[PDB]
Amino acid sequence: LITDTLSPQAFEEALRAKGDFYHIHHPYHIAMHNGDATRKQIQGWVANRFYYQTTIPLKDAAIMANCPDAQTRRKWVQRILDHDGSHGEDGGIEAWLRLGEAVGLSRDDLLSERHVLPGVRFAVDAYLNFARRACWQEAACSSLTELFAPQIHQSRLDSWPQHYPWIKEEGYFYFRSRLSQANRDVEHGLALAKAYCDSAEKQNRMLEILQFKLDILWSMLDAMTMAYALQRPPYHTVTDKAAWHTTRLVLEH
Amino acid sequence: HMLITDTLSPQAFEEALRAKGDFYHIHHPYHIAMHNGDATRKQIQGWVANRFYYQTTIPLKDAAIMANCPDAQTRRKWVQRILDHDGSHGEDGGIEAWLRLGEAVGLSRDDLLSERHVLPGVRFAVDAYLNFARRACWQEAACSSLTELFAPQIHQSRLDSWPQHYPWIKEEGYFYFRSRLSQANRDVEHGLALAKAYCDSAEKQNRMLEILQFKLDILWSMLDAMTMAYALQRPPYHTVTDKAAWHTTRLVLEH
Ligand SMILES: O=C(O)c1cc(C(=O)O)c2c(n1)C(=O)C(=O)c1cc(C(=O)O)[nH]c1-2
Numbered sequence A: 001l002i003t004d005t006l007s008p009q010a011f012e013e014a015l016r017a018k019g020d021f022y023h024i025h026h027p028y029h030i031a032m033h034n035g036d037a038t039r040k041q042i043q044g045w046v047a048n049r050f051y052y053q054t055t056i057p058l059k060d061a062a063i064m065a066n067c068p069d070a071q072t073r074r075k076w077v078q079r080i081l082d083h084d085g086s087h088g089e090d091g092g093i094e095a096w097l098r099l100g101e102a103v104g105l106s107r108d109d110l111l112s113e114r115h116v117l118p119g120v121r122f123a124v125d126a127y128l129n130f131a132r133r134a135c136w137q138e139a140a141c142s143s144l145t146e147l148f149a150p151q152i153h154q155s156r157l158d159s160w161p162q163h164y165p166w167i168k169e170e171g172y173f174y175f176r177s178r179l180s181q182a183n184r185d186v187e188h189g190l191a192l193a194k195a196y197c198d199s200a201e202k203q204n205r206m207l208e209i210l211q212f213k214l215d216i217l218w219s220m221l222d223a224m225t226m227a228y229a230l231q232r233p234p235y236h237t238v239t240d241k242a243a244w245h246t247t248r249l250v251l252e253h
Numbered sequence B: 001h002m003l004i005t006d007t008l009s010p011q012a013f014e015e016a017l018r019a020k021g022d023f024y025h026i027h028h029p030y031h032i033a034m035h036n037g038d039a040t041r042k043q044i045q046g047w048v049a050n051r052f053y054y055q056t057t058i059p060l061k062d063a064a065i066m067a068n069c070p071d072a073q074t075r076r077k078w079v080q081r082i083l084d085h086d087g088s089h090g091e092d093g094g095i096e097a098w099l100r101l102g103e104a105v106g107l108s109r110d111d112l113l114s115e116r117h118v119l120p121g122v123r124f125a126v127d128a129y130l131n132f133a134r135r136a137c138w139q140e141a142a143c144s145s146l147t148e149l150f151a152p153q154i155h156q157s158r159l160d161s162w163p164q165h166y167p168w169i170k171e172e173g174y175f176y177f178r179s180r181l182s183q184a185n186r187d188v189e190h191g192l193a194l195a196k197a198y199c200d201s202a203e204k205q206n207r208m209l210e211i212l213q214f215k216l217d218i219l220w221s222m223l224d225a226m227t228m229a230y231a232l233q234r235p236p237y238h239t240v241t242d243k244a245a246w247h248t249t250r251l252v253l254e255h
Protein backbone atom coordinates (compact mmCIF):
# COMPACT_ATOMS: atom_id res chain seq x y z
CA LEU A 1 0.00 0.00 0.00
CA ILE A 2 1.93 2.97 -1.44
CA THR A 3 2.18 6.20 0.64
CA ASP A 4 5.12 7.92 -1.04
CA THR A 5 4.78 8.08 -4.82
CA LEU A 6 6.88 5.39 -6.55
CA SER A 7 8.86 6.13 -9.69
CA PRO A 8 8.29 5.11 -13.29
CA GLN A 9 10.57 2.17 -12.47
CA ALA A 10 9.54 1.14 -8.92
CA PHE A 11 5.90 1.17 -10.05
CA GLU A 12 6.79 -1.12 -12.97
CA GLU A 13 7.93 -3.68 -10.37
CA ALA A 14 4.71 -3.35 -8.33
CA LEU A 15 2.75 -4.04 -11.53
CA ARG A 16 4.78 -7.11 -12.61
CA ALA A 17 4.74 -8.45 -9.02
CA LYS A 18 0.96 -8.82 -9.57
CA GLY A 19 1.94 -11.56 -12.04
CA ASP A 20 2.20 -13.82 -9.00
CA PHE A 21 -1.62 -13.92 -9.10
CA TYR A 22 -1.83 -14.49 -12.83
CA HIS A 23 -4.11 -17.35 -14.01
CA ILE A 24 -1.16 -19.54 -14.91
CA HIS A 25 -1.29 -20.56 -11.26
CA HIS A 26 -4.90 -21.84 -11.52
CA PRO A 27 -5.41 -25.60 -11.14
CA TYR A 28 -7.43 -25.64 -14.30
CA HIS A 29 -4.54 -24.25 -16.24
CA ILE A 30 -2.08 -26.45 -14.28
CA ALA A 31 -3.97 -29.61 -15.24
CA MET A 32 -3.86 -28.59 -18.91
CA HIS A 33 -0.13 -27.93 -18.85
CA ASN A 34 0.57 -31.41 -17.46
CA GLY A 35 -1.58 -33.42 -19.90
CA ASP A 36 -4.21 -34.40 -17.27
CA ALA A 37 -6.98 -32.47 -18.99
CA THR A 38 -9.56 -34.42 -20.91
CA ARG A 39 -10.97 -33.80 -24.34
CA LYS A 40 -14.22 -32.27 -23.12
CA GLN A 41 -12.27 -30.00 -20.70
CA ILE A 42 -9.99 -28.62 -23.50
CA GLN A 43 -13.02 -28.12 -25.75
CA GLY A 44 -15.03 -26.24 -23.10
CA TRP A 45 -12.00 -24.02 -22.52
CA VAL A 46 -11.55 -23.12 -26.17
CA ALA A 47 -15.22 -22.45 -26.68
CA ASN A 48 -15.51 -20.36 -23.48
CA ARG A 49 -12.36 -18.37 -24.16
CA PHE A 50 -13.82 -17.48 -27.54
CA TYR A 51 -16.24 -15.22 -25.64
CA TYR A 52 -13.19 -13.56 -24.17
CA GLN A 53 -11.58 -13.24 -27.61
CA THR A 54 -14.63 -11.87 -29.43
CA THR A 55 -14.88 -9.31 -26.60
CA ILE A 56 -11.43 -7.74 -26.78
CA PRO A 57 -12.40 -5.75 -29.90
CA LEU A 58 -15.57 -4.51 -28.25
CA LYS A 59 -13.61 -3.40 -25.18
CA ASP A 60 -10.89 -1.68 -27.16
CA ALA A 61 -13.60 0.08 -29.16
CA ALA A 62 -15.11 1.18 -25.87
CA ILE A 63 -11.77 2.61 -24.72
CA MET A 64 -11.44 4.48 -28.01
CA ALA A 65 -14.90 5.93 -27.64
CA ASN A 66 -13.84 7.31 -24.29
CA CYS A 67 -10.50 8.66 -25.47
CA PRO A 68 -10.28 12.03 -27.31
CA ASP A 69 -6.50 11.91 -27.85
CA ALA A 70 -6.17 11.23 -31.56
CA GLN A 71 -2.59 10.01 -31.12
CA THR A 72 -3.58 7.34 -28.60
CA ARG A 73 -6.44 6.11 -30.81
CA ARG A 74 -3.96 5.76 -33.71
CA LYS A 75 -2.10 3.13 -31.67
CA TRP A 76 -5.01 1.52 -29.83
CA VAL A 77 -6.98 0.67 -32.95
CA GLN A 78 -4.18 -1.76 -33.99
CA ARG A 79 -5.43 -4.03 -31.23
CA ILE A 80 -8.70 -4.13 -33.19
CA LEU A 81 -7.12 -4.57 -36.59
CA ASP A 82 -5.29 -7.51 -34.95
CA HIS A 83 -8.32 -9.42 -33.68
CA ASP A 84 -10.84 -8.58 -36.43
CA GLY A 85 -8.18 -9.01 -39.11
CA SER A 86 -8.10 -6.65 -42.04
CA HIS A 87 -10.18 -8.83 -44.56
CA GLY A 88 -12.10 -12.11 -44.58
CA GLU A 89 -9.74 -14.87 -43.54
CA ASP A 90 -7.27 -13.11 -41.20
CA GLY A 91 -7.79 -12.31 -37.51
CA GLY A 92 -6.94 -13.34 -33.97
CA ILE A 93 -10.64 -14.33 -33.94
CA GLU A 94 -10.51 -16.41 -37.11
CA ALA A 95 -7.32 -17.92 -35.71
CA TRP A 96 -9.15 -18.85 -32.59
CA LEU A 97 -12.03 -20.21 -34.62
CA ARG A 98 -9.22 -22.28 -36.21
CA LEU A 99 -7.94 -23.40 -32.83
CA GLY A 100 -11.54 -24.60 -32.28
CA GLU A 101 -11.49 -26.72 -35.45
CA ALA A 102 -8.14 -28.18 -34.35
CA VAL A 103 -9.68 -29.54 -31.12
CA GLY A 104 -12.63 -31.01 -33.01
CA LEU A 105 -15.18 -28.23 -32.64
CA SER A 106 -16.95 -26.61 -35.60
CA ARG A 107 -17.00 -22.87 -36.29
CA ASP A 108 -20.66 -22.84 -35.35
CA ASP A 109 -19.98 -24.49 -31.98
CA LEU A 110 -17.99 -21.33 -31.27
CA LEU A 111 -19.92 -18.61 -33.16
CA SER A 112 -23.15 -19.65 -31.45
CA GLU A 113 -21.71 -18.88 -28.01
CA ARG A 114 -23.99 -21.74 -26.74
CA HIS A 115 -21.24 -23.35 -24.62
CA VAL A 116 -20.27 -20.02 -22.99
CA LEU A 117 -20.89 -20.45 -19.26
CA PRO A 118 -22.62 -17.70 -17.39
CA GLY A 119 -19.76 -17.50 -14.80
CA VAL A 120 -17.48 -16.93 -17.78
CA ARG A 121 -19.90 -14.57 -19.46
CA PHE A 122 -20.21 -12.40 -16.35
CA ALA A 123 -16.45 -12.25 -15.64
CA VAL A 124 -15.87 -11.17 -19.21
CA ASP A 125 -18.75 -8.63 -19.57
CA ALA A 126 -17.39 -6.96 -16.44
CA TYR A 127 -14.22 -6.28 -18.42
CA LEU A 128 -16.31 -4.66 -21.15
CA ASN A 129 -18.52 -2.80 -18.74
CA PHE A 130 -15.42 -1.40 -17.00
CA ALA A 131 -13.97 -0.27 -20.33
CA ARG A 132 -17.25 1.50 -21.13
CA ARG A 133 -17.57 3.50 -17.89
CA ALA A 134 -13.97 4.18 -16.66
CA CYS A 135 -11.69 6.96 -17.91
CA TRP A 136 -9.76 5.69 -20.90
CA GLN A 137 -6.35 5.63 -19.21
CA GLU A 138 -7.60 3.22 -16.54
CA ALA A 139 -9.44 0.99 -18.96
CA ALA A 140 -6.35 1.11 -21.18
CA CYS A 141 -3.92 0.15 -18.49
CA SER A 142 -6.13 -2.76 -17.38
CA SER A 143 -4.89 -4.47 -20.55
CA LEU A 144 -1.53 -4.75 -18.75
CA THR A 145 -1.94 -8.46 -17.89
CA GLU A 146 -0.53 -8.74 -21.37
CA LEU A 147 2.78 -8.44 -19.52
CA PHE A 148 2.45 -12.05 -18.28
CA ALA A 149 0.75 -13.47 -21.36
CA PRO A 150 3.79 -14.37 -23.54
CA GLN A 151 5.02 -16.87 -20.91
CA ILE A 152 1.64 -18.64 -20.77
CA HIS A 153 1.24 -18.66 -24.52
CA GLN A 154 4.66 -20.40 -24.80
CA SER A 155 3.61 -22.70 -21.93
CA ARG A 156 1.04 -24.19 -24.34
CA LEU A 157 3.24 -24.28 -27.47
CA ASP A 158 5.70 -26.48 -25.47
CA SER A 159 3.46 -28.99 -23.84
CA TRP A 160 0.29 -29.54 -25.89
CA PRO A 161 2.16 -31.32 -28.73
CA GLN A 162 3.67 -33.94 -26.35
CA HIS A 163 0.90 -34.38 -23.75
CA TYR A 164 -2.03 -33.83 -26.35
CA PRO A 165 -0.92 -35.23 -29.76
CA TRP A 166 -4.47 -35.15 -31.23
CA ILE A 167 -4.67 -31.37 -31.45
CA LYS A 168 -4.48 -30.52 -35.17
CA GLU A 169 -1.39 -28.54 -36.27
CA GLU A 170 -2.83 -25.20 -37.40
CA GLY A 171 -4.52 -24.16 -34.11
CA TYR A 172 -1.25 -23.37 -32.33
CA PHE A 173 -1.06 -20.24 -34.54
CA TYR A 174 -3.00 -17.84 -32.25
CA PHE A 175 -0.78 -18.59 -29.28
CA ARG A 176 2.12 -17.96 -31.71
CA SER A 177 0.66 -14.83 -33.35
CA ARG A 178 0.47 -13.46 -29.77
CA LEU A 179 4.11 -13.95 -28.63
CA SER A 180 4.80 -10.57 -30.33
CA GLN A 181 1.36 -8.82 -30.60
CA ALA A 182 1.31 -8.74 -26.78
CA ASN A 183 4.83 -7.37 -26.38
CA ARG A 184 3.91 -4.51 -28.77
CA ASP A 185 0.55 -3.95 -26.90
CA VAL A 186 2.32 -3.72 -23.56
CA GLU A 187 4.91 -1.27 -24.84
CA HIS A 188 2.11 1.28 -25.28
CA GLY A 189 0.49 -0.16 -22.15
CA LEU A 190 3.47 0.56 -19.99
CA ALA A 191 4.40 3.97 -21.37
CA LEU A 192 0.80 5.01 -20.56
CA ALA A 193 0.72 3.41 -17.18
CA LYS A 194 4.21 4.69 -16.25
CA ALA A 195 3.24 8.18 -17.48
CA TYR A 196 -0.36 8.63 -16.26
CA CYS A 197 0.01 6.98 -12.82
CA ASP A 198 1.99 9.87 -11.38
CA SER A 199 0.94 9.97 -7.74
CA ALA A 200 0.32 7.60 -4.87
CA GLU A 201 -3.49 7.83 -5.24
CA LYS A 202 -3.31 6.83 -8.88
CA GLN A 203 -0.75 4.09 -8.21
CA ASN A 204 -2.76 2.25 -5.53
CA ARG A 205 -5.95 2.49 -7.56
CA MET A 206 -4.27 1.19 -10.73
CA LEU A 207 -2.94 -1.76 -8.73
CA GLU A 208 -6.57 -2.47 -7.62
CA ILE A 209 -7.58 -2.13 -11.25
CA LEU A 210 -5.04 -4.79 -12.14
CA GLN A 211 -6.25 -7.11 -9.37
CA PHE A 212 -9.75 -6.75 -10.85
CA LYS A 213 -8.43 -7.77 -14.27
CA LEU A 214 -6.75 -10.73 -12.60
CA ASP A 215 -9.94 -11.61 -10.65
CA ILE A 216 -11.76 -11.82 -13.94
CA LEU A 217 -9.30 -14.30 -15.43
CA TRP A 218 -9.42 -16.37 -12.29
CA SER A 219 -13.25 -16.44 -12.23
CA MET A 220 -13.41 -17.48 -15.87
CA LEU A 221 -11.40 -20.54 -14.93
CA ASP A 222 -13.46 -21.06 -11.73
CA ALA A 223 -16.63 -21.49 -13.83
CA MET A 224 -14.67 -23.80 -16.14
CA THR A 225 -13.55 -25.86 -13.17
CA MET A 226 -17.07 -26.16 -11.76
CA ALA A 227 -18.56 -27.27 -15.08
CA TYR A 228 -15.95 -29.53 -16.67
CA ALA A 229 -13.71 -30.73 -13.84
CA LEU A 230 -16.30 -31.08 -11.05
CA GLN A 231 -19.45 -32.18 -12.89
CA ARG A 232 -21.26 -29.15 -11.61
CA PRO A 233 -22.51 -26.98 -14.53
CA PRO A 234 -25.41 -24.59 -14.01
CA TYR A 235 -28.54 -26.46 -13.03
CA HIS A 236 -26.89 -29.96 -12.76
CA THR A 237 -29.23 -30.85 -9.89
CA VAL A 238 -32.21 -30.05 -12.13
CA THR A 239 -31.24 -31.27 -15.66
CA ASP A 240 -28.21 -32.28 -17.63
CA LYS A 241 -29.00 -30.24 -20.75
CA ALA A 242 -27.52 -26.74 -21.11
CA ALA A 243 -30.13 -24.34 -19.75
CA TRP A 244 -28.26 -21.06 -19.27
CA HIS A 245 -28.82 -17.86 -21.26
CA THR A 246 -26.72 -17.71 -24.44
CA THR A 247 -27.22 -14.28 -25.91
CA ARG A 248 -25.52 -10.95 -25.23
CA LEU A 249 -28.89 -9.45 -24.31
CA VAL A 250 -28.12 -5.72 -24.35
CA LEU A 251 -26.09 -5.85 -27.63
CA GLU A 252 -28.46 -8.08 -29.67
CA HIS A 253 -32.19 -8.98 -29.75
CA HIS B 1 -36.03 -26.21 -22.94
CA MET B 2 -39.27 -24.89 -24.45
CA LEU B 3 -40.16 -22.39 -27.14
CA ILE B 4 -43.15 -20.20 -27.89
CA THR B 5 -44.30 -19.98 -31.49
CA ASP B 6 -47.72 -18.45 -31.08
CA THR B 7 -48.20 -15.34 -28.81
CA LEU B 8 -49.47 -16.65 -25.53
CA SER B 9 -52.33 -14.88 -23.78
CA PRO B 10 -51.37 -12.73 -20.77
CA GLN B 11 -52.47 -15.49 -18.39
CA ALA B 12 -50.78 -18.32 -20.23
CA PHE B 13 -47.62 -16.16 -20.42
CA GLU B 14 -47.63 -15.70 -16.70
CA GLU B 15 -47.46 -19.46 -16.30
CA ALA B 16 -44.67 -19.84 -18.71
CA LEU B 17 -42.81 -17.37 -16.49
CA ARG B 18 -43.62 -19.42 -13.46
CA ALA B 19 -42.23 -22.60 -15.02
CA LYS B 20 -38.78 -20.97 -15.01
CA GLY B 21 -39.02 -21.51 -11.20
CA ASP B 22 -37.68 -25.02 -11.84
CA PHE B 23 -34.29 -23.38 -12.28
CA TYR B 24 -34.38 -21.20 -9.13
CA HIS B 25 -31.35 -21.22 -6.77
CA ILE B 26 -33.41 -23.00 -4.13
CA HIS B 27 -32.16 -26.05 -6.17
CA HIS B 28 -28.48 -25.09 -5.79
CA PRO B 29 -26.54 -27.57 -3.54
CA TYR B 30 -25.19 -24.62 -1.52
CA HIS B 31 -28.82 -23.81 -0.46
CA ILE B 32 -29.79 -27.45 -0.03
CA ALA B 33 -26.91 -27.94 2.41
CA MET B 34 -27.86 -24.91 4.42
CA HIS B 35 -31.49 -26.08 4.33
CA ASN B 36 -30.62 -29.62 5.49
CA GLY B 37 -28.34 -28.58 8.39
CA ASP B 38 -25.04 -29.47 6.68
CA ALA B 39 -23.67 -26.00 6.20
CA THR B 40 -20.86 -24.78 8.39
CA ARG B 41 -20.90 -21.54 10.35
CA LYS B 42 -18.14 -20.29 8.07
CA GLN B 43 -20.41 -21.11 5.11
CA ILE B 44 -23.42 -19.33 6.57
CA GLN B 45 -21.30 -16.28 7.47
CA GLY B 46 -19.71 -16.19 4.02
CA TRP B 47 -23.13 -16.39 2.42
CA VAL B 48 -24.44 -13.62 4.60
CA ALA B 49 -21.46 -11.46 3.81
CA ASN B 50 -21.61 -12.07 0.09
CA ARG B 51 -25.39 -11.62 -0.25
CA PHE B 52 -25.07 -8.16 1.33
CA TYR B 53 -23.40 -7.14 -1.93
CA TYR B 54 -26.63 -8.16 -3.67
CA GLN B 55 -28.86 -6.40 -1.15
CA THR B 56 -27.02 -3.12 -1.54
CA THR B 57 -27.11 -3.36 -5.39
CA ILE B 58 -30.88 -3.83 -5.44
CA PRO B 59 -31.54 -0.08 -4.90
CA LEU B 60 -28.81 0.92 -7.34
CA LYS B 61 -30.42 -1.37 -9.97
CA ASP B 62 -33.82 -0.05 -9.22
CA ALA B 63 -32.63 3.49 -9.37
CA ALA B 64 -31.12 2.67 -12.80
CA ILE B 65 -34.47 1.38 -14.01
CA MET B 66 -36.10 4.60 -12.85
CA ALA B 67 -33.47 6.71 -14.67
CA ASN B 68 -34.50 4.86 -17.85
CA CYS B 69 -38.24 5.17 -17.21
CA PRO B 70 -40.14 8.30 -18.51
CA ASP B 71 -43.45 7.12 -17.10
CA ALA B 72 -44.11 8.94 -13.89
CA GLN B 73 -46.89 6.55 -12.90
CA THR B 74 -44.50 3.59 -13.08
CA ARG B 75 -41.84 5.49 -11.14
CA ARG B 76 -44.34 6.30 -8.31
CA LYS B 77 -44.63 2.54 -7.83
CA TRP B 78 -41.06 1.39 -8.54
CA VAL B 79 -39.52 3.84 -6.09
CA GLN B 80 -41.06 1.93 -3.18
CA ARG B 81 -38.53 -0.75 -3.85
CA ILE B 82 -35.81 1.76 -2.93
CA LEU B 83 -37.66 2.96 0.18
CA ASP B 84 -38.04 -0.70 1.31
CA HIS B 85 -34.28 -1.40 1.06
CA ASP B 86 -32.93 2.01 2.05
CA GLY B 87 -35.56 2.59 4.69
CA SER B 88 -36.78 6.00 5.56
CA HIS B 89 -35.88 7.00 9.11
CA GLY B 90 -32.49 5.49 10.10
CA GLU B 91 -32.07 1.89 11.37
CA ASP B 92 -34.91 0.57 9.19
CA GLY B 93 -35.11 -0.88 5.74
CA GLY B 94 -33.82 -4.09 4.17
CA ILE B 95 -30.17 -3.22 4.17
CA GLU B 96 -30.12 -2.55 7.93
CA ALA B 97 -32.09 -5.72 8.52
CA TRP B 98 -29.59 -7.68 6.47
CA LEU B 99 -26.96 -6.10 8.68
CA ARG B 100 -28.82 -7.43 11.75
CA LEU B 101 -28.75 -10.91 10.06
CA GLY B 102 -25.02 -10.46 9.80
CA GLU B 103 -24.91 -9.80 13.57
CA ALA B 104 -27.20 -12.73 14.30
CA VAL B 105 -24.75 -15.12 12.62
CA GLY B 106 -21.78 -13.72 14.50
CA LEU B 107 -20.44 -11.03 12.18
CA SER B 108 -19.99 -7.32 12.88
CA ARG B 109 -21.67 -4.59 10.82
CA ASP B 110 -18.26 -3.68 9.50
CA ASP B 111 -17.46 -7.18 8.21
CA LEU B 112 -20.43 -6.62 5.88
CA LEU B 113 -20.03 -2.89 5.16
CA SER B 114 -16.38 -3.14 4.23
CA GLU B 115 -17.29 -5.60 1.42
CA ARG B 116 -13.88 -7.23 1.93
CA HIS B 117 -15.34 -10.77 1.82
CA VAL B 118 -17.39 -10.24 -1.35
CA LEU B 119 -15.94 -12.81 -3.74
CA PRO B 120 -15.14 -11.58 -7.19
CA GLY B 121 -17.40 -14.26 -8.70
CA VAL B 122 -20.38 -12.91 -6.69
CA ARG B 123 -19.50 -9.34 -7.54
CA PHE B 124 -19.33 -10.00 -11.26
CA ALA B 125 -22.67 -11.75 -11.27
CA VAL B 126 -24.33 -9.09 -9.15
CA ASP B 127 -22.71 -6.36 -11.24
CA ALA B 128 -24.12 -7.89 -14.42
CA TYR B 129 -27.63 -7.32 -13.08
CA LEU B 130 -26.90 -3.66 -12.42
CA ASN B 131 -25.28 -3.22 -15.84
CA PHE B 132 -28.28 -4.77 -17.55
CA ALA B 133 -30.66 -2.45 -15.71
CA ARG B 134 -28.52 0.46 -16.75
CA ARG B 135 -28.57 -0.37 -20.52
CA ALA B 136 -31.73 -2.29 -21.30
CA CYS B 137 -35.07 -0.63 -21.80
CA TRP B 138 -36.91 -0.03 -18.59
CA GLN B 139 -39.62 -2.65 -19.14
CA GLU B 140 -37.12 -5.46 -19.76
CA ALA B 141 -35.06 -4.40 -16.77
CA ALA B 142 -38.13 -4.15 -14.50
CA CYS B 143 -39.24 -7.55 -15.62
CA SER B 144 -35.93 -9.19 -14.73
CA SER B 145 -37.12 -8.72 -11.15
CA LEU B 146 -39.68 -11.48 -11.55
CA THR B 147 -37.54 -14.26 -10.00
CA GLU B 148 -39.14 -12.60 -7.02
CA LEU B 149 -42.05 -14.91 -7.97
CA PHE B 150 -40.05 -17.70 -6.36
CA ALA B 151 -38.58 -15.78 -3.44
CA PRO B 152 -41.23 -16.16 -0.70
CA GLN B 153 -40.76 -19.93 -0.86
CA ILE B 154 -37.00 -19.70 -0.41
CA HIS B 155 -37.34 -17.25 2.48
CA GLN B 156 -39.92 -19.41 4.16
CA SER B 157 -37.61 -22.46 3.73
CA ARG B 158 -34.94 -20.72 5.79
CA LEU B 159 -37.42 -19.57 8.39
CA ASP B 160 -38.62 -23.19 8.61
CA SER B 161 -35.27 -24.99 8.74
CA TRP B 162 -32.55 -22.70 10.14
CA PRO B 163 -33.78 -22.42 13.79
CA GLN B 164 -33.66 -26.27 14.28
CA HIS B 165 -30.26 -26.74 12.59
CA TYR B 166 -28.48 -23.55 13.70
CA PRO B 167 -29.99 -22.38 17.00
CA TRP B 168 -26.93 -20.13 17.67
CA ILE B 169 -28.39 -17.87 14.99
CA LYS B 170 -30.18 -15.14 16.88
CA GLU B 171 -33.91 -14.68 16.54
CA GLU B 172 -33.67 -11.09 15.31
CA GLY B 173 -31.69 -12.12 12.22
CA TYR B 174 -34.88 -13.63 10.78
CA PHE B 175 -36.52 -10.26 10.42
CA TYR B 176 -35.44 -9.76 6.81
CA PHE B 177 -36.60 -13.12 5.52
CA ARG B 178 -39.92 -12.53 7.15
CA SER B 179 -40.32 -8.95 5.82
CA ARG B 180 -39.91 -10.17 2.25
CA LEU B 181 -42.79 -12.63 2.33
CA SER B 182 -45.02 -9.65 1.68
CA GLN B 183 -42.70 -7.15 -0.06
CA ALA B 184 -41.83 -9.78 -2.68
CA ASN B 185 -45.58 -10.28 -3.31
CA ARG B 186 -46.36 -6.58 -3.64
CA ASP B 187 -43.31 -6.35 -5.98
CA VAL B 188 -44.53 -9.14 -8.23
CA GLU B 189 -48.04 -7.75 -8.60
CA HIS B 190 -46.60 -4.82 -10.48
CA GLY B 191 -43.93 -6.83 -12.29
CA LEU B 192 -46.44 -9.30 -13.67
CA ALA B 193 -48.73 -6.44 -14.81
CA LEU B 194 -45.75 -4.96 -16.62
CA ALA B 195 -44.67 -8.22 -18.24
CA LYS B 196 -48.15 -9.03 -19.39
CA ALA B 197 -48.72 -5.60 -20.97
CA TYR B 198 -45.30 -5.34 -22.57
CA CYS B 199 -44.64 -8.91 -23.75
CA ASP B 200 -47.59 -9.02 -26.20
CA SER B 201 -45.92 -10.86 -29.08
CA ALA B 202 -44.00 -14.09 -29.47
CA GLU B 203 -40.62 -12.45 -30.01
CA LYS B 204 -40.98 -10.47 -26.79
CA GLN B 205 -42.24 -13.45 -24.79
CA ASN B 206 -39.23 -15.56 -25.79
CA ARG B 207 -36.86 -12.71 -25.16
CA MET B 208 -38.38 -12.20 -21.70
CA LEU B 209 -37.94 -15.87 -20.91
CA GLU B 210 -34.28 -15.57 -21.81
CA ILE B 211 -34.02 -12.39 -19.69
CA LEU B 212 -35.48 -14.29 -16.72
CA GLN B 213 -32.98 -17.09 -17.45
CA PHE B 214 -30.16 -14.50 -17.29
CA LYS B 215 -31.48 -13.43 -13.89
CA LEU B 216 -31.56 -17.06 -12.83
CA ASP B 217 -27.97 -17.56 -13.99
CA ILE B 218 -26.87 -14.57 -11.87
CA LEU B 219 -28.27 -16.11 -8.74
CA TRP B 220 -26.78 -19.51 -9.55
CA SER B 221 -23.32 -18.16 -10.31
CA MET B 222 -23.36 -16.28 -7.00
CA LEU B 223 -23.68 -19.55 -5.25
CA ASP B 224 -21.10 -21.27 -7.49
CA ALA B 225 -18.57 -18.71 -6.32
CA MET B 226 -19.56 -19.35 -2.71
CA THR B 227 -19.17 -23.11 -3.27
CA MET B 228 -15.64 -22.78 -4.62
CA ALA B 229 -14.56 -20.57 -1.72
CA TYR B 230 -16.36 -21.93 1.33
CA ALA B 231 -17.18 -25.58 0.51
CA LEU B 232 -14.28 -26.69 -1.74
CA GLN B 233 -11.50 -24.67 -0.11
CA ARG B 234 -10.84 -23.05 -3.46
CA PRO B 235 -11.24 -19.25 -3.04
CA PRO B 236 -9.43 -17.01 -5.55
CA TYR B 237 -5.61 -17.52 -5.53
CA HIS B 238 -5.65 -20.45 -3.05
CA THR B 239 -2.64 -22.03 -4.84
CA VAL B 240 -0.46 -18.93 -4.17
CA THR B 241 -1.54 -17.36 -0.81
CA ASP B 242 -4.20 -18.05 1.75
CA LYS B 243 -4.55 -14.33 2.21
CA ALA B 244 -7.61 -12.65 0.69
CA ALA B 245 -6.24 -10.95 -2.44
CA TRP B 246 -9.22 -10.09 -4.64
CA HIS B 247 -10.20 -6.54 -5.47
CA THR B 248 -12.65 -5.07 -2.97
CA THR B 249 -13.95 -1.85 -4.52
CA ARG B 250 -16.76 -0.93 -6.85
CA LEU B 251 -14.28 0.65 -9.18
CA VAL B 252 -16.65 2.66 -11.37
CA LEU B 253 -18.61 4.20 -8.51
CA GLU B 254 -15.96 5.00 -5.93
CA HIS B 255 -12.19 5.68 -5.56
O1 LIG C 1 -4.37 -16.79 -23.23
C1 LIG C 1 -4.15 -16.08 -22.24
O2 LIG C 1 -3.91 -16.57 -21.02
C2 LIG C 1 -4.37 -14.64 -22.45
C3 LIG C 1 -4.46 -13.78 -21.35
C4 LIG C 1 -4.77 -12.44 -21.54
C5 LIG C 1 -4.75 -11.52 -20.36
O3 LIG C 1 -3.87 -11.68 -19.51
O4 LIG C 1 -5.64 -10.53 -20.24
C6 LIG C 1 -4.99 -12.00 -22.94
C7 LIG C 1 -4.88 -13.01 -24.02
N1 LIG C 1 -4.58 -14.27 -23.73
C8 LIG C 1 -5.10 -12.67 -25.43
O5 LIG C 1 -5.05 -13.55 -26.27
C9 LIG C 1 -5.43 -11.30 -25.83
O6 LIG C 1 -5.62 -11.02 -27.03
C10 LIG C 1 -5.60 -10.31 -24.76
C11 LIG C 1 -5.92 -9.00 -24.87
C12 LIG C 1 -5.91 -8.56 -23.55
C13 LIG C 1 -6.29 -7.19 -23.16
O7 LIG C 1 -6.55 -6.98 -21.98
O8 LIG C 1 -6.45 -6.29 -24.12
N2 LIG C 1 -5.59 -9.53 -22.65
C14 LIG C 1 -5.39 -10.63 -23.37
Ligand SMILES: O=C(O)c1cc(C(=O)O)c2c(n1)C(=O)C(=O)c1cc(C(=O)O)[nH]c1-2
Residues within 6 Å of the ligand: B058, B094, B144, B145, B146, B147, B148, B150, B151, B154, B155, B180, B219
Ligand atom coordinates in the same frame (compact mmCIF):
# COMPACT_ATOMS: atom_id res chain seq x y z
O1 LIG D 1 -32.95 -14.80 -0.82
C1 LIG D 1 -33.31 -14.95 -1.97
O2 LIG D 1 -33.24 -16.14 -2.55
C2 LIG D 1 -33.74 -13.78 -2.77
C3 LIG D 1 -33.83 -13.86 -4.13
C4 LIG D 1 -34.13 -12.76 -4.90
C5 LIG D 1 -34.34 -12.97 -6.36
O3 LIG D 1 -35.01 -13.92 -6.76
O4 LIG D 1 -33.85 -12.13 -7.21
C6 LIG D 1 -34.35 -11.48 -4.21
C7 LIG D 1 -34.21 -11.51 -2.74
N1 LIG D 1 -33.92 -12.65 -2.13
C8 LIG D 1 -34.38 -10.32 -1.88
O5 LIG D 1 -34.14 -10.47 -0.64
C9 LIG D 1 -34.70 -9.02 -2.57
O6 LIG D 1 -34.89 -7.99 -1.91
C10 LIG D 1 -34.78 -8.98 -4.07
C11 LIG D 1 -35.02 -7.95 -4.95
C12 LIG D 1 -34.96 -8.56 -6.22
C13 LIG D 1 -35.08 -7.94 -7.57
O7 LIG D 1 -34.68 -8.54 -8.52
O8 LIG D 1 -35.43 -6.71 -7.81
N2 LIG D 1 -34.68 -9.87 -6.14
C14 LIG D 1 -34.62 -10.17 -4.84
